[PDB]
Amino acid sequence: RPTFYRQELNKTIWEVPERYQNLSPVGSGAYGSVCAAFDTKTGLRVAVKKLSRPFQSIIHAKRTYRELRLLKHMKHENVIGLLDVFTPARSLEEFNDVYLVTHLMGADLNNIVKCQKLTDDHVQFLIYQILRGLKYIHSADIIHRDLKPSNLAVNEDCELKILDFATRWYRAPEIMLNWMHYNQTVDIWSVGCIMAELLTGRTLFPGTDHIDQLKLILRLVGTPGAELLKKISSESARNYIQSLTQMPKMNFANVFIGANPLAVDLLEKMLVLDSDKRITAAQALAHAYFAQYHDPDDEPVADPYDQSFESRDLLIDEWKSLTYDEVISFVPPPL
Ligand SMILES: CN(C)CCNC(=O)c1cc2c(cnn2CC2CCCCC2)cc1Cc1ccc(F)cc1F
Ligand SMILES: Fc1ccc(-c2n[nH]cc2-c2ccncc2)cc1
């Protein structure tokens, strides 16, 4: 066991190993509290997240276990991974706090898309890396569910990482309709919304609520056709759609004028209303828009990921002991 030092940062208190120095608050909210730090063992600038009340309730305890299992499994250049996980407690009885460590990135995509306007080549490379990370995530039967600029970080090399899994302007419309069985291409919808925003500098669907959001989407891609209507079980959904002033699929080349025709074509394949017809991450990496970057032998998939715990009804102490197990079995990655 290493040796710890303590401090108060904002109103959070922090107990971390000596190796992590110069902790500076980066922001805080539901997830927990995040500090930037300098790792003296490796020389890396790292990001340290202290979970908020990880074992306060069954939902918190399960969510804590979920996040740690996920982060420990992701080993991919475009997906955040675990550099380290530690607790100050020396026993399971005292175990009450969890800190997670990952590489610190330079800026989030929210601060690139406002502070400058992005060239087509940057858009190619950035979307390529998202899709490459998404191919790996999806190959593990994992859905991100919350892809958006603020959950994407880039360094000065323009290298990109997807972070923090799970009216929202980037959410697939089958969720605005509350369909219970949405699939992994909800993430592709979000990528479509993001790439559109990098090309125009404007939010694509800046809706004010679930209803306004769906209306902005249908104005671009048009009302659902009969093949898609046949798949909607919800009678209220079905009725609301059949009794809207019907609208045609706009031509995307008109909407996204001046954009590379290949970027427009890919956008048409991502922002399809019917989720069964949406392009997948693996197929999108092979789209000609990414010819400059696509390499089928350097777009790996993930080892299988056991998500059986998701269906379990356990006590707080059981979720907590399972989390402790995962802290101790952690093997840092080869430096
Ligand atoms: C909307 N999100 C923000 C929710 C909260 N996520 C983070 O604050 C976060 C951001 C991260 C990183 C890494 N690089 N950057 C990009 C930032 C860095 C500060 C300013 C420039 C851009 C990590 C984490 C969170 C985090 C995850 C896992 C982990 F093991 C430790 C963690 F710390
Ligand atoms: F208006 C819309 C918008 C999206 C959809 C949709 N796309 N993919 C799947 C669905 C869907 C929606 C509701 N119920 C089942 C399936 C259906 C109607």
What is the residue with the minimal CA distance to atom 5 of ligand 2?
174
Active-site residue (options: 108, 120, 164, 212): 164
Spatial CA neighbour of 3 closest among 32, 33, 40, 34: 40
Judge whether 147 and 108 are in contact, CB under 8 Å: no
Q: Is 297 helix (H, G, I), strand (E, B) or coil?
A: helix
DSSP string over 29-57:
SSSEEEEEEEETTTTEEEEEEEESSTTSS
Q: Which ligand is nearest to the CA of 50?
A: 1
265 an active-site residue?
no
d(CA 139, ligand 1 centre) in Å = 24
49 lines ligand 1 (CB under 6 A): yes
CATH code where residue 118 lies: 1.10.510.10
Encoded tokens for 37:
């730090």
Q: Which range of residues forms the domain containing residue 114?
A: 107-298
Residues 8 and 153 occupy one common structural domain: no
Encoded tokens for 109:
């995509």
Residues 141 and 260 occupy one common structural domain: yes
Rounded-to-10 torsion of CA 288, 289, 293, 299: -70
Spatial CA neighbour of 191 closest among 132, 117, 259, 277: 132
- Does residue 334 sit within a domain? no
User: Which experimental approach was used here?
Assistant: X-ray
Spatial CA neighbour of 171 closest among 124, 126, 216, 113: 216
For the purposes of burial, counting CB atoms within 10 Å of the CB of 93, is it exposed (0-12), middle (13-18) or buried (19 or more)? exposed
Distances (CA, A) of 335 to 17, 71, 320, 331: 18, 17, 29, 11
b (16+ CB within 10 A) / e for 61-79: bbbbbbbbbbbbbbebebb
> CA-to-CA distance for 54 and 62, rounded, in angstroms?
9
Residues 74 and 13 occupy one common structural domain: yes
Q: Which residues are bridge partners to 24 per DSSP?
A: 36
Residues 255 and 181 occupy one common structural domain: yes
Number of domains present in the structure of the chain: 2
DSSP string over 168-191:
-TTS-HHHHTT-TT--TTHHHHHH
Residues 126 and 34 occupy one common structural domain: no
46 lines ligand 1 (CB under 6 A): no
Judge whether 80 and 58 are in contact, CB under 8 Å: no
Distance of CA 306 to the CA centre of its chain: 19
> CA-to-CA distance for 327 and 86, rounded, in angstroms?
6
Resolution value, angstrom units: 2.1
- Does residue 333 sit within a domain? no
Residues 144 and 81 occupy one common structural domain: no
Encoded tokens for 28:
């805080």
- Does residue 229 sit within a domain? yes
- Does residue 168 sit within a domain? yes
Q: What is the CB neighbour count within 10 angstroms for residue 41? A: 14
Judge whether 217 and 228 are in contact, CB under 8 Å: no
CATH code where residue 57 lies: 3.30.200.20
Residues 62 and 34 occupy one common structural domain: yes
275 lines ligand 2 (CB under 6 A): yes
Residues 195 and 281 occupy one common structural domain: yes
What is the residue with the minimal CA distance to atom 16 of ligand 2?
232
Spatial CA neighbour of 195 closest among 142, 125, 135: 125
- Does residue 335 sit within a domain? no
Distances (CA, A) of 133 to 75, 159, 164: 10, 12, 13
Residues 307 and 288 occupy one common structural domain: no
Residues 10 and 49 occupy one common structural domain: yes
Residues 182 and 284 occupy one common structural domain: yes
Rounded-to-10 torsion of CA 67, 72, 78, 80: 50
Encoded tokens for 288:
């000609």
- Does residue 20 sit within a domain? yes
Q: Is 28 helix (H, G, I), strand (E, B) or coil?
A: strand
> CA-to-CA distance for 142 and 160, rounded, in angstroms?
19
d(CA 140, ligand 2 centre) in Å = 24
Residues 139 and 73 occupy one common structural domain: no
> CA-to-CA distance for 87 and 50, rounded, in angstroms?
10
d(CA 165, ligand 2 centre) in Å = 23
Spatial CA neighbour of 55 closest among 312, 328, 314: 314
